């Protein structure tokens, strides 16, 4: 599986079956963007994990 990872495309390790993209905002002044290969998502984030090449732009 290949995933976007901030302007690189990367091949996931064998045990990482998902691509992931999500954006968080822990503090008023801070936005963070997590994007890459991943393991399975929590129940609450199932839509953030996808399992086809480059699915996580």
Q: How far is the CB of 21 from a second copy (least distance, A)?
A: 10
Site string for a second copy, 1-40 (x = CB under 8 A): ----xx-x-x--xxxxx--x-xxxxxxxxxxxxxxxxxxx
Report if residue 49 touches a second copy, rule: CB under 8 A. Answer: no
Rounded Cα gap, residues 56 and 5, in angstroms: 9
Based on its alpha-carbon atoms, the radius of gyration of the chain, rounded to whole angstroms, reads 12
Residue appearing with tokens 């822990």: 26
- Which of 34, 33, 39 has the alpha carbon at shortest distance from 1? 39
List contacts with a second copy (CB under 8 A): 5-6, 8, 10, 13-17, 20, 22-40, 42, 45
């Amino acid at each position: 599986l290949k995933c976007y990872q901030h302007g690189k495309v990367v091949t996931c390790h064998r045990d990482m079956k998902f691509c992931y993209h999500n954006t968080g905002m822990p503090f008023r002044n801070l936005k963070l963007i997590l994007q890459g290969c991943s393991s399975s998502c929590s129940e609450t984030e199932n839509n953030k994990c996808c399992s086809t090449d480059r699915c996580n732009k």
